[PDB]
Every structure is written in structure tokens, then in C-alpha cells.
CSV table of C-alpha atoms in Angstrom, one decimal:
chain,number,residue,atom,x,y,z
A,2,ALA,CA,-34.7,-2.4,-1.4
A,3,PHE,CA,-32.5,0.1,-3.2
A,4,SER,CA,-30.6,-2.7,-5.0
A,5,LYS,CA,-34.0,-3.3,-6.6
A,6,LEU,CA,-34.8,0.0,-7.6
A,7,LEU,CA,-31.5,0.3,-9.1
A,8,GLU,CA,-32.5,-2.9,-10.9
A,9,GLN,CA,-35.4,-1.0,-12.1
A,10,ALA,CA,-33.0,2.1,-13.3
A,11,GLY,CA,-30.5,-0.4,-14.9
A,12,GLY,CA,-28.4,-1.6,-12.2
A,13,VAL,CA,-27.7,-4.3,-14.8
A,14,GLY,CA,-27.1,-1.4,-17.2
A,15,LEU,CA,-23.9,-0.5,-19.0
A,16,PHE,CA,-23.4,2.3,-16.6
A,17,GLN,CA,-22.1,-0.2,-14.4
A,18,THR,CA,-19.5,-1.5,-16.9
A,19,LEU,CA,-18.5,2.1,-17.9
A,20,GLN,CA,-18.1,3.1,-14.1
A,21,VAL,CA,-15.8,0.0,-13.6
A,22,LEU,CA,-13.7,0.8,-16.5
A,23,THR,CA,-13.1,4.3,-15.5
A,24,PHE,CA,-12.3,3.2,-11.8
A,25,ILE,CA,-9.9,0.5,-13.2
A,26,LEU,CA,-7.4,3.7,-14.0
A,27,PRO,CA,-7.2,5.1,-10.7
A,28,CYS,CA,-7.0,1.3,-9.1
A,29,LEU,CA,-4.1,0.8,-11.7
A,30,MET,CA,-2.1,3.9,-10.6
A,31,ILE,CA,-2.5,3.7,-6.8
A,32,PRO,CA,-0.2,1.0,-6.1
A,33,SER,CA,2.6,2.9,-8.1
A,34,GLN,CA,2.0,5.8,-5.9
A,35,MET,CA,2.3,4.0,-2.5
A,36,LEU,CA,4.9,1.6,-3.3
A,37,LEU,CA,7.1,4.0,-5.4
A,38,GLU,CA,9.6,4.6,-2.9
A,39,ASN,CA,10.9,1.1,-3.3
A,40,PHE,CA,12.3,2.2,-6.7
A,41,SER,CA,12.4,6.0,-6.2
A,42,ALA,CA,14.2,5.6,-3.0
A,43,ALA,CA,16.1,2.5,-3.7
A,44,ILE,CA,19.5,2.3,-1.9
A,45,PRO,CA,22.6,2.4,-4.0
A,46,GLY,CA,26.0,0.8,-3.4
A,47,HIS,CA,27.5,3.6,-1.1
A,48,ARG,CA,30.9,4.4,0.3
A,49,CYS,CA,32.8,7.1,2.2
A,50,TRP,CA,34.2,10.2,-0.1
A,51,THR,CA,37.8,9.8,0.4
A,52,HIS,CA,40.5,12.1,-0.7
A,53,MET,CA,42.4,9.1,-2.3
A,54,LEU,CA,39.4,8.2,-4.3
A,55,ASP,CA,37.5,11.4,-5.3
A,56,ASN,CA,40.3,14.0,-5.4
A,67,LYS,CA,40.9,-0.6,-7.1
A,68,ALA,CA,43.9,-0.8,-5.1
A,69,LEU,CA,43.3,2.7,-3.6
A,70,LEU,CA,39.9,1.6,-2.4
A,71,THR,CA,41.3,-0.8,0.2
A,72,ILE,CA,43.9,1.7,1.3
A,73,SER,CA,41.4,4.4,1.5
A,74,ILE,CA,38.1,2.4,2.9
A,75,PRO,CA,38.1,-0.6,5.5
A,76,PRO,CA,36.8,-4.0,5.3
A,77,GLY,CA,32.8,-4.4,6.0
A,78,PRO,CA,30.7,-6.7,8.1
A,79,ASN,CA,29.2,-8.2,4.7
A,80,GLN,CA,32.9,-8.7,3.5
A,81,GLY,CA,32.8,-5.8,1.2
A,82,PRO,CA,33.9,-2.0,1.3
A,83,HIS,CA,32.5,-0.6,4.6
A,84,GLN,CA,29.4,1.7,3.7
A,85,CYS,CA,29.8,4.0,6.6
A,86,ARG,CA,33.2,4.8,7.5
A,87,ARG,CA,36.8,5.3,6.2
A,88,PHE,CA,40.6,5.0,7.3
A,89,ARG,CA,41.7,8.7,8.5
A,90,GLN,CA,45.2,8.0,7.1
A,91,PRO,CA,45.6,5.8,4.1
A,92,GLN,CA,47.0,2.4,5.3
A,93,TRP,CA,49.6,1.8,2.5
A,94,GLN,CA,50.4,-1.1,4.9
A,95,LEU,CA,48.0,-3.2,2.9
A,105,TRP,CA,44.8,-1.9,11.3
A,106,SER,CA,42.6,-0.7,14.4
A,107,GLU,CA,39.0,0.5,14.5
A,108,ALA,CA,40.7,3.6,15.9
A,109,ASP,CA,42.0,4.3,12.3
A,110,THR,CA,38.3,4.7,11.2
A,111,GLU,CA,36.4,7.9,11.0
A,112,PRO,CA,32.6,8.5,9.8
A,113,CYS,CA,32.3,10.0,6.5
A,114,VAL,CA,32.6,13.7,7.4
A,115,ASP,CA,33.1,14.7,3.7
A,116,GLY,CA,30.0,12.6,2.5
A,117,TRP,CA,29.4,9.6,0.3
A,118,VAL,CA,30.1,8.3,-3.4
A,119,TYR,CA,27.0,6.4,-4.6
A,120,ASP,CA,27.1,3.8,-7.3
A,121,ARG,CA,25.1,4.8,-10.4
A,122,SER,CA,25.2,1.5,-12.3
A,123,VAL,CA,22.0,0.1,-11.3
A,124,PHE,CA,20.1,3.3,-10.1
A,125,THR,CA,20.8,6.6,-11.9
A,126,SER,CA,19.0,8.6,-9.2
A,127,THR,CA,17.3,8.0,-6.0
A,128,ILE,CA,16.3,10.1,-3.0
A,129,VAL,CA,18.8,8.2,-0.7
A,130,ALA,CA,21.4,9.8,-2.9
A,131,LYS,CA,19.9,13.3,-2.9
A,132,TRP,CA,19.6,13.6,0.8
A,133,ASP,CA,22.1,11.2,2.0
A,134,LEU,CA,19.5,8.7,3.6
A,135,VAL,CA,22.4,6.4,4.4
A,136,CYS,CA,24.2,5.3,7.6
A,137,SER,CA,23.1,6.9,10.5
A,138,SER,CA,20.0,8.3,8.5
A,139,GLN,CA,19.2,4.9,7.0
A,140,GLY,CA,15.9,4.9,8.7
A,141,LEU,CA,14.6,7.9,7.4
A,142,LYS,CA,13.8,5.7,4.5
A,143,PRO,CA,11.4,3.6,6.3
A,144,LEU,CA,9.9,6.5,8.1
A,145,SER,CA,8.9,8.4,4.7
A,146,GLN,CA,7.2,5.2,4.0
A,147,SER,CA,5.3,5.6,7.3
A,148,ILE,CA,4.5,9.1,7.0
A,149,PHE,CA,2.6,8.2,3.8
A,150,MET,CA,0.7,5.3,5.7
A,151,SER,CA,-0.1,7.8,8.5
A,152,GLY,CA,-1.2,10.2,5.7
A,153,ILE,CA,-3.6,7.5,4.8
A,154,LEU,CA,-5.0,6.8,8.3
A,155,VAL,CA,-5.3,10.5,9.1
A,156,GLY,CA,-6.8,11.1,5.8
A,157,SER,CA,-9.4,8.3,5.6
A,158,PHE,CA,-10.6,9.4,9.0
A,159,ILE,CA,-11.2,13.1,7.8
A,160,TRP,CA,-12.7,12.1,4.5
A,161,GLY,CA,-15.1,10.0,6.6
A,162,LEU,CA,-16.4,13.2,8.5
A,163,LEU,CA,-16.4,15.5,5.6
A,164,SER,CA,-18.3,12.6,3.7
A,165,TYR,CA,-21.7,13.7,5.3
A,166,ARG,CA,-21.3,17.3,4.1
A,167,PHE,CA,-19.5,16.9,0.8
A,168,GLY,CA,-20.6,14.5,-2.0
A,169,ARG,CA,-18.6,11.4,-3.1
A,170,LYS,CA,-18.0,12.7,-6.8
A,171,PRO,CA,-16.8,16.1,-5.7
A,172,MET,CA,-14.3,14.3,-3.2
A,173,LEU,CA,-13.2,11.9,-5.7
A,174,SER,CA,-12.3,14.8,-8.2
A,175,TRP,CA,-10.6,17.0,-5.6
A,176,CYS,CA,-8.7,14.0,-4.1
A,177,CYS,CA,-7.5,13.1,-7.7
A,178,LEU,CA,-6.1,16.8,-8.0
A,179,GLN,CA,-4.7,17.0,-4.5
A,180,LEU,CA,-2.8,13.6,-5.3
A,181,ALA,CA,-1.6,15.0,-8.6
A,182,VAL,CA,-0.5,18.5,-7.7
A,183,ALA,CA,1.4,17.0,-4.7
A,184,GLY,CA,3.0,14.0,-6.4
A,185,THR,CA,4.0,16.2,-9.3
A,186,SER,CA,5.4,19.0,-6.9
A,187,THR,CA,7.6,16.5,-5.0
A,188,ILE,CA,9.9,16.5,-7.9
A,189,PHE,CA,10.8,20.1,-7.0
A,190,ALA,CA,11.0,19.6,-3.1
A,191,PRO,CA,14.4,21.1,-1.8
A,192,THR,CA,14.7,19.2,1.4
A,193,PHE,CA,13.7,15.8,3.1
A,194,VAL,CA,11.2,17.4,5.5
A,195,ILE,CA,9.1,19.0,2.4
A,196,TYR,CA,9.5,15.7,0.5
A,197,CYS,CA,7.9,13.8,3.3
A,198,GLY,CA,5.3,16.5,3.7
A,199,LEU,CA,4.5,16.3,0.2
A,200,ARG,CA,4.0,12.6,0.3
A,201,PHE,CA,1.6,13.0,3.2
A,202,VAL,CA,-0.6,15.2,1.4
A,203,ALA,CA,-0.5,12.8,-1.4
A,204,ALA,CA,-1.4,10.0,1.0
A,205,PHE,CA,-4.1,12.1,2.4
A,206,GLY,CA,-5.5,12.6,-1.1
A,207,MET,CA,-5.3,8.9,-1.9
A,208,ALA,CA,-7.2,8.2,1.2
A,209,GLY,CA,-10.2,10.1,-0.2
A,210,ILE,CA,-9.7,8.5,-3.7
A,211,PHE,CA,-10.0,4.8,-2.0
A,212,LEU,CA,-13.1,5.8,-0.2
A,213,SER,CA,-14.9,7.9,-2.8
A,214,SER,CA,-14.1,5.2,-5.5
A,215,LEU,CA,-15.2,2.3,-3.4
A,216,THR,CA,-18.2,4.0,-2.1
A,217,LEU,CA,-19.4,5.0,-5.3
A,218,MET,CA,-18.9,1.7,-7.1
A,219,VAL,CA,-20.8,-0.4,-4.2
A,220,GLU,CA,-23.5,2.1,-4.3
A,221,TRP,CA,-24.4,2.3,-7.9
A,222,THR,CA,-24.7,-1.3,-8.3
A,223,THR,CA,-27.0,-4.0,-6.8
A,224,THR,CA,-25.9,-6.1,-4.0
A,225,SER,CA,-25.4,-9.2,-6.0
A,226,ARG,CA,-22.7,-7.6,-8.4
A,227,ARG,CA,-21.0,-6.1,-5.3
A,228,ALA,CA,-19.0,-9.0,-4.6
A,229,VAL,CA,-18.0,-9.2,-8.2
A,230,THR,CA,-17.1,-5.4,-8.9
A,231,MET,CA,-15.1,-5.7,-5.8
A,232,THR,CA,-13.1,-8.6,-7.1
A,233,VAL,CA,-12.5,-6.8,-10.6
A,234,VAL,CA,-11.1,-3.7,-8.4
A,235,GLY,CA,-8.9,-6.1,-6.6
A,236,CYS,CA,-7.7,-7.5,-9.6
A,237,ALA,CA,-7.0,-4.0,-11.0
A,238,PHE,CA,-4.9,-3.2,-8.0
A,239,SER,CA,-3.0,-6.3,-8.5
A,240,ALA,CA,-2.2,-5.4,-12.2
A,241,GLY,CA,-1.2,-2.0,-10.8
A,242,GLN,CA,1.7,-3.4,-8.5
A,243,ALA,CA,2.8,-5.3,-11.3
A,244,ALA,CA,2.9,-2.2,-13.6
A,245,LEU,CA,5.0,-0.7,-11.1
A,246,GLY,CA,7.7,-2.9,-11.7
A,247,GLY,CA,7.5,-2.3,-15.5
A,248,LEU,CA,7.2,1.5,-15.0
A,249,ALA,CA,10.5,1.5,-12.9
A,250,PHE,CA,12.3,-1.0,-15.3
A,251,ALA,CA,11.7,1.9,-18.1
A,252,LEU,CA,12.1,5.0,-15.9
A,253,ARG,CA,15.2,5.0,-13.6
A,254,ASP,CA,15.2,8.6,-12.6
A,255,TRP,CA,13.4,9.1,-9.5
A,256,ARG,CA,11.9,12.6,-10.6
A,257,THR,CA,10.7,10.7,-13.9
A,258,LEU,CA,9.2,8.0,-11.7
A,259,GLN,CA,7.2,10.3,-9.5
A,260,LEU,CA,5.7,12.4,-12.5
A,261,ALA,CA,4.7,9.2,-14.4
A,262,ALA,CA,3.0,7.8,-11.1
A,263,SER,CA,1.4,11.2,-10.2
A,264,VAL,CA,0.8,13.1,-13.3
A,265,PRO,CA,-1.7,10.4,-14.6
A,266,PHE,CA,-3.9,11.6,-12.1
A,267,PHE,CA,-4.8,15.0,-13.5
A,268,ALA,CA,-6.5,12.9,-16.3
A,269,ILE,CA,-8.4,10.9,-13.9
A,270,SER,CA,-9.7,13.9,-12.3
A,271,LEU,CA,-11.0,15.2,-15.6
A,272,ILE,CA,-12.4,11.9,-16.5
A,273,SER,CA,-14.1,11.6,-13.1
A,274,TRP,CA,-16.5,14.3,-13.8
A,275,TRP,CA,-18.6,12.1,-16.1
A,276,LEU,CA,-19.5,9.9,-13.0
A,277,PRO,CA,-22.7,10.9,-11.5
A,278,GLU,CA,-23.2,11.3,-7.6
A,279,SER,CA,-24.3,8.5,-5.3
A,280,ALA,CA,-27.9,8.4,-5.6
A,281,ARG,CA,-28.0,6.7,-2.2
A,282,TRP,CA,-26.1,9.6,-0.4
A,283,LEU,CA,-28.4,12.2,-2.1
A,284,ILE,CA,-31.6,10.7,-0.8
A,285,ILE,CA,-30.1,10.2,2.7
A,286,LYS,CA,-28.8,13.6,2.7
A,287,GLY,CA,-32.4,15.2,1.6
A,288,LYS,CA,-32.4,15.7,-1.8
A,289,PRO,CA,-34.7,13.6,-3.7
A,290,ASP,CA,-35.1,16.0,-6.6
A,291,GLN,CA,-31.3,15.8,-7.3
A,292,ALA,CA,-31.4,12.1,-6.9
A,293,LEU,CA,-34.3,11.3,-9.1
A,294,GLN,CA,-32.0,13.1,-11.8
A,295,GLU,CA,-29.2,11.0,-11.7
A,296,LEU,CA,-31.1,7.8,-11.8
A,297,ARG,CA,-32.7,9.1,-14.9
A,298,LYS,CA,-29.6,9.6,-16.4
A,299,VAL,CA,-27.9,6.3,-15.4
A,300,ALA,CA,-31.0,4.7,-17.0
A,301,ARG,CA,-30.6,6.6,-20.0
A,302,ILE,CA,-26.9,5.3,-20.2
A,303,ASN,CA,-28.6,1.9,-19.5
A,304,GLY,CA,-30.6,2.3,-22.9
A,305,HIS,CA,-33.4,2.0,-20.4
A,313,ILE,CA,-40.4,9.9,-6.1
A,314,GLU,CA,-42.9,7.9,-4.3
A,315,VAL,CA,-41.6,4.7,-5.6
A,316,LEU,CA,-37.9,5.8,-4.5
A,317,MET,CA,-39.0,6.6,-0.9
A,318,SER,CA,-41.2,3.6,0.0
A,319,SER,CA,-38.2,1.4,-1.2
A,320,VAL,CA,-35.3,3.5,0.8
A,321,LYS,CA,-37.2,4.6,3.7
A,322,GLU,CA,-36.1,1.5,5.8
A,323,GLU,CA,-32.2,2.5,4.8
A,324,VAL,CA,-32.8,6.0,5.7
A,337,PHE,CA,-18.6,-4.8,20.4
A,338,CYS,CA,-20.6,-4.3,23.8
A,339,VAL,CA,-22.0,-7.8,23.9
A,340,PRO,CA,-19.4,-10.1,25.8
A,341,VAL,CA,-19.3,-12.7,22.9
A,342,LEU,CA,-19.1,-10.1,20.4
A,343,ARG,CA,-16.4,-8.3,22.5
A,344,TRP,CA,-14.4,-11.6,22.3
A,345,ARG,CA,-14.8,-12.1,18.3
A,346,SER,CA,-14.0,-8.6,17.7
A,347,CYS,CA,-10.5,-8.7,19.6
A,348,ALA,CA,-9.6,-11.8,17.6
A,349,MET,CA,-10.5,-10.2,14.6
A,350,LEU,CA,-8.7,-7.0,15.4
A,351,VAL,CA,-5.4,-9.2,16.2
A,352,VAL,CA,-5.6,-10.8,12.8
A,353,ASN,CA,-6.2,-7.8,10.7
A,354,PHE,CA,-3.5,-5.9,12.4
A,355,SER,CA,-0.9,-8.8,12.1
A,356,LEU,CA,-1.7,-9.3,8.4
A,357,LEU,CA,-1.3,-5.8,7.4
A,358,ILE,CA,1.9,-5.2,9.7
A,359,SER,CA,3.5,-8.3,7.9
A,360,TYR,CA,2.1,-7.5,4.4
A,361,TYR,CA,3.1,-3.9,4.4
A,362,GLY,CA,6.5,-4.9,5.8
A,363,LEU,CA,7.0,-7.3,3.1
A,364,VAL,CA,5.7,-5.0,0.1
A,365,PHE,CA,7.8,-2.0,1.4
A,366,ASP,CA,11.2,-4.1,1.7
A,367,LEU,CA,11.7,-5.4,-1.8
A,368,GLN,CA,15.3,-4.7,-2.0
A,369,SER,CA,15.9,-6.8,1.3
A,370,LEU,CA,14.0,-9.5,-0.1
A,371,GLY,CA,15.9,-10.0,-3.4
A,372,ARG,CA,18.5,-8.2,-5.2
A,373,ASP,CA,16.2,-7.8,-8.5
A,374,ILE,CA,13.5,-5.6,-7.5
A,375,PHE,CA,11.9,-4.9,-10.6
A,376,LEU,CA,11.3,-8.5,-11.3
A,377,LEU,CA,10.1,-9.0,-7.7
A,378,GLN,CA,7.5,-6.4,-8.0
A,379,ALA,CA,6.1,-7.5,-11.1
A,380,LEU,CA,6.0,-11.1,-9.9
A,381,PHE,CA,4.4,-10.0,-6.6
A,382,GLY,CA,1.6,-8.3,-8.5
A,383,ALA,CA,1.1,-11.6,-10.5
A,384,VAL,CA,0.9,-14.0,-7.7
A,385,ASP,CA,-1.8,-12.0,-6.4
A,386,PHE,CA,-4.0,-13.0,-9.5
A,387,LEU,CA,-2.9,-16.6,-9.1
A,388,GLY,CA,-3.7,-16.5,-5.4
A,389,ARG,CA,-7.3,-15.3,-6.0
A,390,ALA,CA,-8.1,-18.0,-8.4
A,391,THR,CA,-6.5,-20.8,-6.3
A,392,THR,CA,-8.5,-19.4,-3.2
A,393,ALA,CA,-11.9,-20.5,-4.7
A,394,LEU,CA,-10.6,-24.1,-5.4
A,395,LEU,CA,-9.1,-24.1,-2.0
A,396,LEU,CA,-12.2,-22.9,-0.4
A,397,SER,CA,-14.1,-25.6,-2.0
A,398,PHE,CA,-12.2,-28.4,-0.7
A,399,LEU,CA,-11.5,-26.8,2.9
A,400,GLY,CA,-13.0,-24.0,5.1
A,401,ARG,CA,-12.7,-20.2,5.5
A,402,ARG,CA,-10.8,-20.7,8.5
A,403,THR,CA,-8.4,-23.4,8.0
A,404,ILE,CA,-7.5,-21.6,4.7
A,405,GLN,CA,-6.8,-18.4,6.6
A,406,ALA,CA,-4.7,-19.8,9.3
A,407,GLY,CA,-3.0,-21.9,7.2
A,408,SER,CA,-2.1,-19.1,4.3
A,409,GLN,CA,-1.0,-16.9,7.2
A,410,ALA,CA,1.3,-19.5,8.7
A,411,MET,CA,2.5,-20.4,5.2
A,412,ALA,CA,3.5,-16.7,4.5
A,413,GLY,CA,5.0,-16.3,8.0
A,414,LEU,CA,7.3,-19.4,7.1
A,415,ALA,CA,8.2,-18.2,4.0
A,416,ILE,CA,9.3,-14.4,5.3
A,417,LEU,CA,11.3,-16.8,7.9
A,418,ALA,CA,12.7,-18.8,5.0
A,419,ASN,CA,13.9,-16.0,3.0
A,420,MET,CA,15.9,-14.6,5.7
A,421,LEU,CA,17.6,-17.7,6.3
A,422,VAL,CA,18.1,-18.5,2.5
A,423,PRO,CA,21.5,-17.7,1.3
A,424,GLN,CA,22.1,-14.4,-0.8
A,425,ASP,CA,24.0,-16.6,-3.5
A,426,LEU,CA,20.6,-18.7,-4.0
A,427,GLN,CA,18.9,-15.6,-5.5
A,428,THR,CA,16.1,-17.7,-7.3
A,429,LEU,CA,14.9,-19.4,-4.0
A,430,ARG,CA,14.9,-16.1,-2.2
A,431,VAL,CA,12.6,-14.5,-5.0
A,432,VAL,CA,10.4,-17.7,-4.9
A,433,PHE,CA,9.9,-17.7,-1.0
A,434,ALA,CA,9.0,-14.0,-1.2
A,435,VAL,CA,6.5,-14.3,-4.0
A,436,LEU,CA,5.2,-17.2,-1.9
A,437,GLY,CA,5.0,-14.9,1.1
A,438,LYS,CA,3.0,-12.3,-1.0
A,439,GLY,CA,0.7,-14.8,-2.6
A,440,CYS,CA,-0.3,-16.3,0.8
A,441,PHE,CA,-0.9,-12.9,2.3
A,442,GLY,CA,-3.3,-12.3,-0.6
A,443,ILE,CA,-5.1,-15.7,0.3
A,444,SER,CA,-5.5,-14.6,3.8
A,445,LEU,CA,-6.7,-11.0,3.0
A,446,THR,CA,-9.2,-12.5,0.7
A,447,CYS,CA,-10.3,-15.0,3.0
A,448,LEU,CA,-10.7,-12.3,5.8
A,449,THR,CA,-12.7,-10.2,4.0
A,450,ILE,CA,-15.4,-12.8,3.2
A,451,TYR,CA,-15.1,-13.8,6.8
A,452,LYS,CA,-15.4,-10.2,8.0
A,453,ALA,CA,-18.4,-9.2,6.2
A,454,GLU,CA,-20.2,-12.7,7.3
A,455,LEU,CA,-19.5,-12.4,11.0
A,456,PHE,CA,-20.9,-9.0,11.9
A,457,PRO,CA,-24.7,-8.2,11.4
A,458,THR,CA,-25.9,-5.4,8.9
A,459,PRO,CA,-26.7,-3.1,11.7
A,460,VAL,CA,-23.3,-3.7,13.0
A,461,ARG,CA,-21.4,-4.5,10.2
A,462,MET,CA,-20.5,-0.8,9.4
A,463,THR,CA,-19.1,-0.5,13.0
A,464,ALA,CA,-17.1,-3.5,13.5
A,465,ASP,CA,-15.8,-3.1,9.7
A,466,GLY,CA,-14.9,0.5,10.1
A,467,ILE,CA,-12.8,-0.4,13.7
A,468,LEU,CA,-11.0,-3.4,11.8
A,469,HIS,CA,-10.2,-1.0,9.0
A,470,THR,CA,-9.0,1.5,11.5
A,471,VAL,CA,-6.8,-1.0,13.0
A,472,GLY,CA,-5.6,-2.4,9.7
A,473,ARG,CA,-4.4,1.0,8.6
A,474,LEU,CA,-2.8,1.5,12.0
A,475,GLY,CA,-0.8,-1.8,11.2
A,476,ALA,CA,0.0,-0.6,7.8
A,477,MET,CA,1.7,2.5,9.5
A,478,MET,CA,3.6,0.2,12.2
A,479,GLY,CA,4.8,-2.3,9.1
A,480,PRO,CA,7.1,0.3,7.5
A,481,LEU,CA,8.3,1.4,11.2
A,482,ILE,CA,9.6,-1.9,12.2
A,483,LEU,CA,12.0,-1.5,9.2
A,484,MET,CA,13.4,1.2,10.8
A,485,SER,CA,15.0,-1.4,13.5
A,486,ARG,CA,17.1,-2.9,10.6
A,487,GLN,CA,20.1,-0.5,12.2
A,488,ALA,CA,20.0,-2.1,15.5
A,489,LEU,CA,19.1,-5.7,14.5
A,490,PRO,CA,19.2,-6.8,11.0
A,491,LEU,CA,17.1,-9.9,11.6
A,492,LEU,CA,14.5,-7.9,13.7
A,493,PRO,CA,12.4,-6.9,10.9
A,494,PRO,CA,12.1,-10.5,9.2
A,495,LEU,CA,11.7,-12.4,12.5
A,496,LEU,CA,8.8,-9.9,13.6
A,497,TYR,CA,6.7,-10.3,10.5
A,498,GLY,CA,7.5,-13.9,10.8
A,499,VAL,CA,6.6,-14.6,14.2
A,500,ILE,CA,3.7,-12.0,14.4
A,501,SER,CA,2.1,-14.0,11.3
A,502,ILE,CA,2.6,-17.5,12.8
A,503,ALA,CA,0.9,-16.1,16.1
A,504,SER,CA,-2.1,-14.6,14.2
A,505,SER,CA,-2.3,-18.2,12.5
A,506,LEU,CA,-2.9,-19.7,15.9
A,507,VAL,CA,-5.5,-17.1,16.7
A,508,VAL,CA,-7.5,-17.5,13.5
A,509,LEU,CA,-7.4,-21.3,14.3
A,510,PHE,CA,-8.5,-21.1,17.9
A,511,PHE,CA,-10.8,-18.3,18.3
A,512,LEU,CA,-12.7,-17.8,14.8
A,513,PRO,CA,-15.7,-20.3,13.9
A,514,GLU,CA,-17.1,-20.8,10.3
């Protein structure tokens, strides 16, 4: 019924249009913050510092061949081989590394030597961020009953800004990783507050649309990261450009009014009455309020079964999605083009999804799309490095397909669970999905031991979930 009241107080008003415009800004800058370390932490060609090179032929005698048929990136000859050997003439870089600055002027990987034995510290930084999202989204949820959505949006925008601008002045990796947890903690409160405010200040019909617009803004945001990176190579400038813009969003998040629904459930009808009156004034437009909102104010074995399959699918999609989006450099050599293309293939996917759904079903599409994504990830690892266009095409197909599955899952998710239980099951699924997103960047830590372990796991997991969707999900 609250949707109805809002209909009365201009749920069809301009205040919705303006609210969506204002929220498009945080949604355009969030993907840049999360996936920034694909460009700020890019791995540049590195080699041992040798006395013969830093104090073309000199390269060979100083540094041995490598497994990828190139200067080894981890060890050097103790004594120069003017003979040009045994693995015994090799020593790890005791004196450090000499990174190439041709493509990436400055990357964290060069600042804190996140190479060789430490090559896993880069994927961990991306999982400390993701954990910071999970721990944050949990805490902000608890604090949601006590504090308002608007104050939480404004604070969490400042938290992200301070912490994000501050990382540029971080002397050690521990501090960097810590200041990325704080930034992610804040971003979780932005995701929560933004969504909750937009959903709750619109009628139930427009919700599905409003969410589509927010989703499109995120896709444009991913694309824009590639562009912002192409312009700002220095990691410090990229971090400021993806963090500073939040201070402005925090100041322009004051115009927004507090969720009326929250105020009423909280217990404050007078405050709630004021906001609706204001939104209405924007739209050029107490007993009525209560009578309408009074109603609003997996134990079952079948439900237990569906829930498990759903959790397995939501975990798998996001343990493979995040793996792909956090590993741009391993996919194709041009990361800048790839990020932009990834952001673009999301829009195309959204649009294709509808036609595909017309002809087929929410279950076939999901499974088929997931399988296709897994197959694409498997193809990329197999496709030769020389054929770059093919490698890029398969990755973009993988990203698009994950987008088709994540769109289909959402529709299916809400549909399968009753309104009393939608909140519980949806929340549990999201918690599982966030755990998956924190174990996606972590499987990439295993590249050291077995290079093909990351792509093989993302591929096989996706294909396995495809089967689960096909067998244990109805329409």
C-alpha cells in the first residue's frame, strides 16, 4: 500500500528522476574503485637487478632464459656467463628488480616489489577489499535500524573519499591494504544506502526499471575505468581520480531526503510526514499514512532444497565473475581496451537477454549462459597468445554471458521466494555471493603453483553450476 501513498505523493514525480540522476554518479564511480587494482597494480615486465646491467648482449650473460622463452623474471646468474649453464649458477634477485616503464609508468607492483615470491600479494589486496565489502555490508546492515539511510550514505561517501585519497600517501603495503579495507567498508554502506533509498522512494512497478537504470550506470562505470586509466597512467593519479570524486557525491547526497518508510517503521511519523510533503513539492504536486503502512509495519524441506541449489549457483557465478574481472591482464594483453569492452558487453547482454527470454525460459537461458561463459574462459586459456583478437573476443563473451546469467538469476531469485521470506533468502544468497566474490580474487593467488589452476577452476565451476541450474531449478 505504501507504493500507493507514494503514488499520491508523486511517486510518479520528478523527485524520482532527480534521485536517479544523483545516484548515477556514485554508480559510475564504484566500478572504478573496485577494479582499480587491475591498472594501479598492473604487473610490468620485471627482471633481476644485475651488476652488469644497472651499474642487449649484456642481458643474456647477466640473466638466464625463462619458461615463457624470455628473460627470466625471478633469477639471475651469480657470475656472468661470458660463455654464451646450470641451474646452480642462478640466484634469486637479492639486489631487487628493474621494472619496465614503457607501458605502465608506475604501479604498486613496482613500489612494494609484489613480484616473484610475492606475486600473490596483488590478488590478496583484491580479496581484502572484497572481504572489506562483506564485513561492511554486514555491519552497515546492523546499524541500519539505529541510523538513517541518508546519514549512512553521506558518511560512507566521505569514508570512501578520505580513505581512497589517503592511499596515495601510504608508506607500506600493510597500510595500503588496510586503507583499501576501509574504502571497501565504506562502499558497502554506499551500495546498501543507495539501493535502499531508491527502491523505497519509488512505487513497486517502477522498481524493476529503476534497478535496470542503476545496473546500466554500473556498466558504464566499468567502461569508464578503462578510459580513465588510459589517460592517467600513474597509480597515484588514478587513485585520486577514482576516490576524490566522492567528496562531491557526499556533498550532493544531502539534497536527498530520508526514506519515509524507514521513518515510519522507526516510529517517527512527524518526520516522515515532512519528507513526503517535500518530495511532493518537488513533484509539483497521518491517518492516511498509517492505515496504509500498518501492514508493512529454508526450514521447509522443499525450500531447503531449492535454497541450496540457488546458493551454489550464486556462489559459482560470482567466484568466476570476480575471477575474470580481477584478472584482466592474464586474459588479454591490452587491458585498457578489455575493460572498456567488458563494460560495453554488459549493455549488449542486458538488451539481448530480453529477446532471448521471449523465445526461451528463465532457466534455459541461465544455464546455457553460464555454460557458455565457462566455455569461453576455458577457450581463452587454450587460445594462443599470438592470436590476441581471439583471446579478447572470448573474454568479452565470457563477461557478457556472466551478465546474462546474473540478470536471469535476479529475476528468478525474487520470483522463487515469498514476500515474507524474500528478505531472508535473498539476504542469505547475497551473503554467499559476497563470500564468493572474496574467494574469486583468492583463487588467483594459486597461479604461482599452477598457472592453469585459475582458469580451469572458473571454467569447471561455471560448467558445474550450469548443470545445477538445469536440473534443480524450475520456472
